[PDB]
CSV table of N, CA, C and O in Angstrom, one decimal:
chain,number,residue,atom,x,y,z
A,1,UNK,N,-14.7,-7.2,1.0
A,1,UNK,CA,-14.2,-8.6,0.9
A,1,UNK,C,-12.8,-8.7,1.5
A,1,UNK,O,-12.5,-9.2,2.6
A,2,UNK,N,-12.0,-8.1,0.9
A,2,UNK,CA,-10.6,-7.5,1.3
A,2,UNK,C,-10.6,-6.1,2.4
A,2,UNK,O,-11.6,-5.5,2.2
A,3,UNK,N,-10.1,-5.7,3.1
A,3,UNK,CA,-9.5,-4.9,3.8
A,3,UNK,C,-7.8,-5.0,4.7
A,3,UNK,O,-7.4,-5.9,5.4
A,4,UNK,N,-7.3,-3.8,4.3
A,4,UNK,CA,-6.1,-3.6,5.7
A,4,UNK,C,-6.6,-3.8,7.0
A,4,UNK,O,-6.0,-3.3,8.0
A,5,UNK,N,-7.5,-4.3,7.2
A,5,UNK,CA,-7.9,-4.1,8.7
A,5,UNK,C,-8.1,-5.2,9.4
A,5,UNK,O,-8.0,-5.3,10.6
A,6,UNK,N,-8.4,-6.4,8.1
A,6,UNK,CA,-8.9,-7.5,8.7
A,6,UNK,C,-7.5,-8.3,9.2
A,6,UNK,O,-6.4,-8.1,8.8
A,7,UNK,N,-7.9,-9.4,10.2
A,7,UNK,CA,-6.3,-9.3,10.8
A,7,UNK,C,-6.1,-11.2,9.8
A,7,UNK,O,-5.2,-11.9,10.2
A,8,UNK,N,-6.8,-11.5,8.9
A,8,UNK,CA,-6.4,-12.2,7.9
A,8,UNK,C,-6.0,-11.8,6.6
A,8,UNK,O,-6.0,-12.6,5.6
A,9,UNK,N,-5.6,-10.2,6.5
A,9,UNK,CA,-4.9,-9.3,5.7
A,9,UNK,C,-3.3,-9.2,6.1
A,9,UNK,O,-2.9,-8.7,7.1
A,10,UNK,N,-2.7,-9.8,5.4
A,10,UNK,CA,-1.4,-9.6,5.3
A,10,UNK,C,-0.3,-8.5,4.3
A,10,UNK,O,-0.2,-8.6,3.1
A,11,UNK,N,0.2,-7.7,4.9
A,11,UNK,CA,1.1,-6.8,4.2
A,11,UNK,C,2.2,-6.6,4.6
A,11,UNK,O,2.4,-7.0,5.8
A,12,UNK,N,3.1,-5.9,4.0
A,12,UNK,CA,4.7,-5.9,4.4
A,12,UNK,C,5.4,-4.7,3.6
A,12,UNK,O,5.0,-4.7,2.4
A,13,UNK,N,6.3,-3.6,4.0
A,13,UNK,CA,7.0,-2.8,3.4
A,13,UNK,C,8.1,-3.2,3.0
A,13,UNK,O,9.0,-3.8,3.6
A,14,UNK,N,8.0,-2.9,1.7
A,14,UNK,CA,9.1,-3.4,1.0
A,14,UNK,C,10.7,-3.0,1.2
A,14,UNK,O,11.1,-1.9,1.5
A,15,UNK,N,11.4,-4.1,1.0
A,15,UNK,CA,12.7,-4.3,1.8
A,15,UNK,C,13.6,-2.6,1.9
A,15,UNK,O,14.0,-2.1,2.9
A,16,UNK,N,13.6,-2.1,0.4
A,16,UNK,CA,14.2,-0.6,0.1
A,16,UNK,C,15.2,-0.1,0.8
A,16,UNK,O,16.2,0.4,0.2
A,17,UNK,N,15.0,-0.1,2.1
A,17,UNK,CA,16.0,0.8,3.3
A,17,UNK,C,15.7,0.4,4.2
A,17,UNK,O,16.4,-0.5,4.7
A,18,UNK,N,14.7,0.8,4.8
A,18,UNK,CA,13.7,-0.2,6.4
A,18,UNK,C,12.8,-0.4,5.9
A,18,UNK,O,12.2,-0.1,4.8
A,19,UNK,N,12.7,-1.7,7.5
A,19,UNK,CA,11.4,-2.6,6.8
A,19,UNK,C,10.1,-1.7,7.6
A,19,UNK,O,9.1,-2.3,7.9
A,20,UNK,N,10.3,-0.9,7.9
A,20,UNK,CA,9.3,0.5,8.6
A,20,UNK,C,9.1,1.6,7.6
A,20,UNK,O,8.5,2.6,7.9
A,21,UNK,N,9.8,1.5,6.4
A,21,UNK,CA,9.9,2.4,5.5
A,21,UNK,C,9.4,2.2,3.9
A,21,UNK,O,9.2,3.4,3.8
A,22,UNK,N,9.2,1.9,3.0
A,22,UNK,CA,9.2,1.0,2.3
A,22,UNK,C,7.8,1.4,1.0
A,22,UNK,O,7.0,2.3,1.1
A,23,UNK,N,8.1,0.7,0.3
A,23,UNK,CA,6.4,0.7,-0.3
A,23,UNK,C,5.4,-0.6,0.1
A,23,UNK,O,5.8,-1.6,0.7
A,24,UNK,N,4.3,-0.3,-0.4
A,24,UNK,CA,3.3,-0.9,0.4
A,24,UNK,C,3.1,-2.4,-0.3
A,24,UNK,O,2.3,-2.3,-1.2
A,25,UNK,N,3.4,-3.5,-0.1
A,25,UNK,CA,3.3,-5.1,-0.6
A,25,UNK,C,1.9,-5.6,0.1
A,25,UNK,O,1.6,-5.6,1.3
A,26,UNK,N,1.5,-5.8,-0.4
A,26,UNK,CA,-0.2,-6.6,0.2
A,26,UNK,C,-0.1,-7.7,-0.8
A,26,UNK,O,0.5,-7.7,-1.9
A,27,UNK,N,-0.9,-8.7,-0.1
A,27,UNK,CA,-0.9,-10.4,0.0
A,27,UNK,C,-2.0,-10.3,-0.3
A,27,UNK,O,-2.9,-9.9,0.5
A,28,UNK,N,-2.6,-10.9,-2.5
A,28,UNK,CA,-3.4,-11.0,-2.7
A,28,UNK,C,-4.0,-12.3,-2.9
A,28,UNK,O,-3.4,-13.1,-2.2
A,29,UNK,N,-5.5,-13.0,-3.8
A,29,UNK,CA,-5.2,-14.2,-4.1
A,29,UNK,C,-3.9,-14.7,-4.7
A,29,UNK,O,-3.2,-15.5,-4.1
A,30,UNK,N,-3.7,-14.3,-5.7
A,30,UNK,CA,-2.5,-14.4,-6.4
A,30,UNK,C,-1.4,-14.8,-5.8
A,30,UNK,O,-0.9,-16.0,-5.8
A,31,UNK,N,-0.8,-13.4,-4.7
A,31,UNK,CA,0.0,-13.3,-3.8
A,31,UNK,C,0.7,-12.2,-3.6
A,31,UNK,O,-0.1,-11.2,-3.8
A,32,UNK,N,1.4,-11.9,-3.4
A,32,UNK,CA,2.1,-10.4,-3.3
A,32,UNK,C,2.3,-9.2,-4.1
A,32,UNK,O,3.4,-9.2,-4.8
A,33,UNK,N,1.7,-8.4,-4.2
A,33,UNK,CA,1.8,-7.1,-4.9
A,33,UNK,C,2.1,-6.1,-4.0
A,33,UNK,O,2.2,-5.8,-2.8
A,34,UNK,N,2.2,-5.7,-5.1
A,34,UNK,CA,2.7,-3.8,-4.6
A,34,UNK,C,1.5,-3.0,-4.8
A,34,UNK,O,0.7,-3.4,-5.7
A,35,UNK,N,1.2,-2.0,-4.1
A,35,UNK,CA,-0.3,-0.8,-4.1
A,35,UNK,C,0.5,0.4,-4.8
A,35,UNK,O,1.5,0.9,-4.2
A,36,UNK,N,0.1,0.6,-5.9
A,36,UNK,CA,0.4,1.8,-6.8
A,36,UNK,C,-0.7,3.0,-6.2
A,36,UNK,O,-1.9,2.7,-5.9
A,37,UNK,N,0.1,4.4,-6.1
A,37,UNK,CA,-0.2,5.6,-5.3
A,37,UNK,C,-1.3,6.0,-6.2
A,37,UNK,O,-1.4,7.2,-5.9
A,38,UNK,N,-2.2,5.8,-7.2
A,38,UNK,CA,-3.1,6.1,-7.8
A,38,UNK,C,-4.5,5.6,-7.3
A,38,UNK,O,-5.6,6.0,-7.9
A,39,UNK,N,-4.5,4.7,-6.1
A,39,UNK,CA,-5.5,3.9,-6.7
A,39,UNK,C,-6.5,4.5,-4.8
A,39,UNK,O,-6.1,5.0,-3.8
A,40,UNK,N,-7.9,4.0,-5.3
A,40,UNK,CA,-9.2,4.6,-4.3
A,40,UNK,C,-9.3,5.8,-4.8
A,40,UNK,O,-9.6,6.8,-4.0
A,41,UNK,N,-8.9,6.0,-6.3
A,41,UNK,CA,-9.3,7.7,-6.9
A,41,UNK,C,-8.8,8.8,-6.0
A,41,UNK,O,-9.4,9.8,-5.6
A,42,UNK,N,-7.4,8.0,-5.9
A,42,UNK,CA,-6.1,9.4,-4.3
A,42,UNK,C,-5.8,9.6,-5.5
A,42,UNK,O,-6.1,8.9,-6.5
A,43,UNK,N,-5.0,10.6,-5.4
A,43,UNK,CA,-4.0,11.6,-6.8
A,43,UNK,C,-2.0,11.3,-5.3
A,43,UNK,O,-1.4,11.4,-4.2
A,44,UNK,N,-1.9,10.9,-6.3
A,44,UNK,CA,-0.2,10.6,-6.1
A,44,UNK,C,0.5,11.9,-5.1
A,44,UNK,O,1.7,12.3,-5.1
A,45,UNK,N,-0.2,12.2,-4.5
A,45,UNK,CA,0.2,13.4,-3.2
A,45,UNK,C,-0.3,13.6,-2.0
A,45,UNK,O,-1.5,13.7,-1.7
A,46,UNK,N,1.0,13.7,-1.2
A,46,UNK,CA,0.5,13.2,0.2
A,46,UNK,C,-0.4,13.8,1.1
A,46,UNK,O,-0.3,14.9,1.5
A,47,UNK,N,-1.6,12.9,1.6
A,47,UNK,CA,-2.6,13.2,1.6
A,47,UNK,C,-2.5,13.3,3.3
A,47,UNK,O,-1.5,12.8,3.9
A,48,UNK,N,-3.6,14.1,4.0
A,48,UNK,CA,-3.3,14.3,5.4
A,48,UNK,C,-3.4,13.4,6.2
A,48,UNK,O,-2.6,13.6,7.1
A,49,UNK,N,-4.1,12.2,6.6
A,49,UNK,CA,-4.2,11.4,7.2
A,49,UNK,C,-3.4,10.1,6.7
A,49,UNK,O,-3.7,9.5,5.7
A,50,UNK,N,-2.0,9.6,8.0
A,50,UNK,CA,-1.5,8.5,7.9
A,50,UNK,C,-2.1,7.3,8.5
A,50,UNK,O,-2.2,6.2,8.0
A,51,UNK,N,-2.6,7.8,10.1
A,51,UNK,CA,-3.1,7.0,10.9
A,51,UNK,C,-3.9,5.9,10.6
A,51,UNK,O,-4.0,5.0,11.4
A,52,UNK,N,-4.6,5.7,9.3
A,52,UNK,CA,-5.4,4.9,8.6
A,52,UNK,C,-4.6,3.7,8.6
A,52,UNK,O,-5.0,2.5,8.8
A,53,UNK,N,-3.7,4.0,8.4
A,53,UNK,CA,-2.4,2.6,8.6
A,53,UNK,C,-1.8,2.2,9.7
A,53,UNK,O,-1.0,1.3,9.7
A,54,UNK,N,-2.2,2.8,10.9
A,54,UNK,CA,-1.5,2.5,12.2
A,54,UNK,C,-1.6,0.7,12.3
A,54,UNK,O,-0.5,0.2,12.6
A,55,UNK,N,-2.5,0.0,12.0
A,55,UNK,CA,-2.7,-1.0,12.0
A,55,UNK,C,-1.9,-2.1,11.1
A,55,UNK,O,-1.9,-3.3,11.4
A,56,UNK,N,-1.3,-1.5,10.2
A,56,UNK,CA,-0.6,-1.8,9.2
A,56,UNK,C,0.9,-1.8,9.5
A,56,UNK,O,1.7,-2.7,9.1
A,57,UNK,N,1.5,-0.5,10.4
A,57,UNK,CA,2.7,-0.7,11.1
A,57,UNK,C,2.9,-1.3,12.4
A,57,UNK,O,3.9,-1.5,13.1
A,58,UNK,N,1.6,-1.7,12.6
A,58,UNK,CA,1.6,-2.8,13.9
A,58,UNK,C,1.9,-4.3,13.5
A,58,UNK,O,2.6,-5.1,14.2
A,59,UNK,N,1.3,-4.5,12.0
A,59,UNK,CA,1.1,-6.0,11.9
A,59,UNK,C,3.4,-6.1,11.6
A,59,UNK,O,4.0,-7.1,11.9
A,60,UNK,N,4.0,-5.0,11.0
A,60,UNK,CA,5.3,-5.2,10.9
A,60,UNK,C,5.9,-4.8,12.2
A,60,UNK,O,7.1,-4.5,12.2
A,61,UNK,N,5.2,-4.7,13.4
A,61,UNK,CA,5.7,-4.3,14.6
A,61,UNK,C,6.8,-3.0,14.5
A,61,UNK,O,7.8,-3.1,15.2
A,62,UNK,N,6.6,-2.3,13.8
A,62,UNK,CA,6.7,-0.5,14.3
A,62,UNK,C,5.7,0.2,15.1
A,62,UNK,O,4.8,-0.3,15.7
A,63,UNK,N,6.4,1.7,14.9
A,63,UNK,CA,5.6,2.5,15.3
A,63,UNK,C,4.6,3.1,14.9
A,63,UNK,O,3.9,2.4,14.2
A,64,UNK,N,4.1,4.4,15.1
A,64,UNK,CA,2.9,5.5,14.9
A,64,UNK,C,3.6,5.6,13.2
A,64,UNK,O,4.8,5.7,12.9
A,65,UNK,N,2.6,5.6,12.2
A,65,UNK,CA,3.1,5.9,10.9
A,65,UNK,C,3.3,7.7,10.8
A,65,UNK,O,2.5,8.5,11.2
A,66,UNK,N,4.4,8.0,10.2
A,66,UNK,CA,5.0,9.3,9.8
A,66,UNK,C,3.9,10.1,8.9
A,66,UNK,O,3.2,11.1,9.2
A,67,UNK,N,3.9,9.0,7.6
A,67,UNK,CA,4.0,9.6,6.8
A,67,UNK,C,3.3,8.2,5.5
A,67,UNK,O,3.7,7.0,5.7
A,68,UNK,N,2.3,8.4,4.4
A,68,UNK,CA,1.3,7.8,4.1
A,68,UNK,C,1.3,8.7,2.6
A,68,UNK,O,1.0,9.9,2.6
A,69,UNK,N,1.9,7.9,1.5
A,69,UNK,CA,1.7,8.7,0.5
A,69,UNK,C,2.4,7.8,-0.7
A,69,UNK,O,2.6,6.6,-0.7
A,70,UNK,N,2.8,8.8,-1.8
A,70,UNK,CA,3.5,8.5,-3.1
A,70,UNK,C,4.8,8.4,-2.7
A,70,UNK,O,5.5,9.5,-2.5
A,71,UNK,N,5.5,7.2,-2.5
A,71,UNK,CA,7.0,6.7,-2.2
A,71,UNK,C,8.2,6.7,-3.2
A,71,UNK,O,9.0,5.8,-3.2
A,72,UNK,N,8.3,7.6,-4.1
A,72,UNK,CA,9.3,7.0,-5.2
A,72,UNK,C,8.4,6.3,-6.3
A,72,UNK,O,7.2,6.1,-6.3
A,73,UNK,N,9.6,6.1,-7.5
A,73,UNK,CA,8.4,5.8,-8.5
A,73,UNK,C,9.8,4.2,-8.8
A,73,UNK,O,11.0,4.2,-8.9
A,74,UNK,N,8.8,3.4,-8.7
A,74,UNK,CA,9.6,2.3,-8.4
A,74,UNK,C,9.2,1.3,-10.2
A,74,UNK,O,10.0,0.8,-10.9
A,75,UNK,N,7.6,1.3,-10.2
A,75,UNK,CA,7.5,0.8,-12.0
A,75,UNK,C,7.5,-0.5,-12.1
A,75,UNK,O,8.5,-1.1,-12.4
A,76,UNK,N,6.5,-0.8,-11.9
A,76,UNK,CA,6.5,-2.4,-11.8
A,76,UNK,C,4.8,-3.0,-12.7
A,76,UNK,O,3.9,-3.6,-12.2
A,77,UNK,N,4.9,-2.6,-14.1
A,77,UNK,CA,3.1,-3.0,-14.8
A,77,UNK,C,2.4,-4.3,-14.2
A,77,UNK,O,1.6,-4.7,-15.0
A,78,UNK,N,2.5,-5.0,-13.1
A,78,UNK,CA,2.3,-6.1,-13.1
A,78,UNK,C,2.0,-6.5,-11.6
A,78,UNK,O,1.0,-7.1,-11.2
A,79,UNK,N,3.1,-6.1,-11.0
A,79,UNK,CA,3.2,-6.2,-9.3
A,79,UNK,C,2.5,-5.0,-8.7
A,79,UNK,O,1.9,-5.3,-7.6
A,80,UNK,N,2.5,-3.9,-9.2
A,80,UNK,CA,1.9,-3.0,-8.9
A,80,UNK,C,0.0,-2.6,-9.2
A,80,UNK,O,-0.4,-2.1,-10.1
A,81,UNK,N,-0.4,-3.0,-8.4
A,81,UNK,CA,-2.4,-2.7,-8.5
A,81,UNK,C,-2.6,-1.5,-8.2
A,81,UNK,O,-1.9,-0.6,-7.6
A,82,UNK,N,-4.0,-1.4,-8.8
A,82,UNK,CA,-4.8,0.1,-8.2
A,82,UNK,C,-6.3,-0.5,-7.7
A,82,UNK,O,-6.9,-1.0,-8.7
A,83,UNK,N,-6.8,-0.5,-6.9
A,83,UNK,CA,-8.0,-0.6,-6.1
A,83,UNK,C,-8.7,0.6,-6.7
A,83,UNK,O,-8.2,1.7,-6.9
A,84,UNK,N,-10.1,0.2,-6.8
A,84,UNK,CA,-11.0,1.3,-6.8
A,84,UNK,C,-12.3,1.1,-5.8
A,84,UNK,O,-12.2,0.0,-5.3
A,85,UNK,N,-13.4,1.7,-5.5
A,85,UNK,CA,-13.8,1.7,-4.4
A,85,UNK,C,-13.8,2.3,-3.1
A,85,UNK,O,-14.0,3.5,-3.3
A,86,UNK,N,-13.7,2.0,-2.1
A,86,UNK,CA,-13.7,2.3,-0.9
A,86,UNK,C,-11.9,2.4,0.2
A,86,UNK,O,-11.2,1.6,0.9
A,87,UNK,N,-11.8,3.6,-0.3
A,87,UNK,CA,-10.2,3.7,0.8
A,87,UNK,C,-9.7,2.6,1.8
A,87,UNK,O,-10.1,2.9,2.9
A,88,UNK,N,-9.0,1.3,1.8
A,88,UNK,CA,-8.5,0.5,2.9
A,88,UNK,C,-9.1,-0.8,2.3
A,88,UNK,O,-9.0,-1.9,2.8
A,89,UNK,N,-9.7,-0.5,1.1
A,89,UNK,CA,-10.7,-2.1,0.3
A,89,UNK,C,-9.3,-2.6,-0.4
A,89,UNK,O,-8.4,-2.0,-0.9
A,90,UNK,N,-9.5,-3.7,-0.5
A,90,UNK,CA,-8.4,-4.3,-1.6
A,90,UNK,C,-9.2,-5.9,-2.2
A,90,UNK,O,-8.8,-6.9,-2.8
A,91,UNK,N,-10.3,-5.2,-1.8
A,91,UNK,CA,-11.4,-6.4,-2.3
A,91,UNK,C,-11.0,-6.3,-4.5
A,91,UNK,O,-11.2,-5.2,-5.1
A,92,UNK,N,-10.7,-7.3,-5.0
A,92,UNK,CA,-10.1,-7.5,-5.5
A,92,UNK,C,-9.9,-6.7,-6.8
A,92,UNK,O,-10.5,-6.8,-7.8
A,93,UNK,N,-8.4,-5.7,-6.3
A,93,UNK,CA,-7.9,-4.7,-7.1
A,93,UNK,C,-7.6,-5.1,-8.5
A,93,UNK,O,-7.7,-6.3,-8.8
A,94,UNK,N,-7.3,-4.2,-9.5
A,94,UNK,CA,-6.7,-4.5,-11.0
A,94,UNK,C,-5.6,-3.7,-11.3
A,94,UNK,O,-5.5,-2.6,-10.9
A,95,UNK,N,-4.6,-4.5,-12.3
A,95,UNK,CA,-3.6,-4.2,-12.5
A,95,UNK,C,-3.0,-2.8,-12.9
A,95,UNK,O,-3.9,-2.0,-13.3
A,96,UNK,N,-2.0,-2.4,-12.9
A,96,UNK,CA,-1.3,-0.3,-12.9
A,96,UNK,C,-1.1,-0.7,-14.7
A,96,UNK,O,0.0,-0.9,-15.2
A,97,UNK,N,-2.5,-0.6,-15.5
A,97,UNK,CA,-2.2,-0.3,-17.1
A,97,UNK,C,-2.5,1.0,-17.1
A,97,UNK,O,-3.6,1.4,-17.4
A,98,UNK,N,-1.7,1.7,-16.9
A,98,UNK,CA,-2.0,3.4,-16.6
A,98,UNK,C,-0.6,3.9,-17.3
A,98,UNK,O,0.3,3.0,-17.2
A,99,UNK,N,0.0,5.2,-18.1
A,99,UNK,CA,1.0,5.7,-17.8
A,99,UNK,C,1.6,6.5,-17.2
A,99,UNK,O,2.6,7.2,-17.6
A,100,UNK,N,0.7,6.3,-15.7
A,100,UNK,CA,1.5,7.5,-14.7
A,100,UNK,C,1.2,5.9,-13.2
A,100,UNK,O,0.2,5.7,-12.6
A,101,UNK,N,1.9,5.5,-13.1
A,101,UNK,CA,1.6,4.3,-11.7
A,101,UNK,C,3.0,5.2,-10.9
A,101,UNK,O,4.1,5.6,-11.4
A,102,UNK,N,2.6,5.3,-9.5
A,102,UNK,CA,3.7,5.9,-8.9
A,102,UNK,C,3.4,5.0,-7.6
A,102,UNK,O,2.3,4.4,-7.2
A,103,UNK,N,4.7,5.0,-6.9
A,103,UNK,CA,4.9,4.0,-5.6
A,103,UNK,C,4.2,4.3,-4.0
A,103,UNK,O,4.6,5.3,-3.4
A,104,UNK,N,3.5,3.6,-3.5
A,104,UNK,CA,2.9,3.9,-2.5
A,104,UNK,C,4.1,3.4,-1.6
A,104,UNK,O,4.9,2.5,-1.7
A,105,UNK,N,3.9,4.5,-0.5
A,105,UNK,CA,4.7,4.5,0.8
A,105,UNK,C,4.3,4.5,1.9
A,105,UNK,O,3.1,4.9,2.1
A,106,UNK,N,4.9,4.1,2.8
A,106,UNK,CA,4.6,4.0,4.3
A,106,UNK,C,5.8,4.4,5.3
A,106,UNK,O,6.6,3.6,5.5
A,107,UNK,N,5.8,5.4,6.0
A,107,UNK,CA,6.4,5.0,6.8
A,107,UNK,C,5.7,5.1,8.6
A,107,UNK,O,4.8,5.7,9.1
A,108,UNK,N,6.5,4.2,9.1
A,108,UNK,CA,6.3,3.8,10.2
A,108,UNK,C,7.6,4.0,11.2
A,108,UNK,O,8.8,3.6,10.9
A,109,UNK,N,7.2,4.6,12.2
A,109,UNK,CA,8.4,4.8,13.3
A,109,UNK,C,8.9,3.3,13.5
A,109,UNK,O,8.3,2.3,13.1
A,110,UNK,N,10.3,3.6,14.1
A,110,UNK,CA,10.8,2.1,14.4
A,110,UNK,C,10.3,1.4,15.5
A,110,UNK,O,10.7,0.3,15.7
């Protein structure tokens, strides 16, 4: 239903340092959340493939993404979701009632 791919998918790295750097904000019904590093049953460590997001640092007009993983633990029970399902789905995620939620990252060349 949802995906990063569809180009009526909206997302944005959060302000932090660069806006090429950031944790990962996706535009739900609701409206804007954060993607907690737990969720598509990934374990909070950086996993080998970034490129999954190339599309994702296009829509903030950067570059080739770096780097695709657990960003800092930022802690947010509310703004922060976990998706389960299918990797890149955000077909409609549920809230970080977990006590380990850690921050998804992105980075994207400038």
């Amino acid at each position: 239903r949802l995906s990063w791919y569809d180009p009526d998918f909206q997302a944005r790295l959060t302000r932090s340092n660069s806006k090429c750097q950031g944790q990962l904000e996706v535009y739900l019904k609701d409206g804007w959340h954060m993607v907690c590093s737990q969720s598509w049953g990934r374990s909070s460590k950086q996993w080998e493939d970034p490129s999954q997001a190339s599309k994702v640092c296009q829509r903030l007009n950067c570059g080739d993404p770096l780097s695709l993983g657990p960003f800092l633990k930022t802690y947010t029970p509310q703004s922060s979701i976990i998706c389960y399902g299918q990797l890149g789905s955000f077909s409609n995620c549920s809230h970080s009632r977990n006590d380990m939620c850690h921050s998804l990252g992105l980075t994207c060349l400038e």
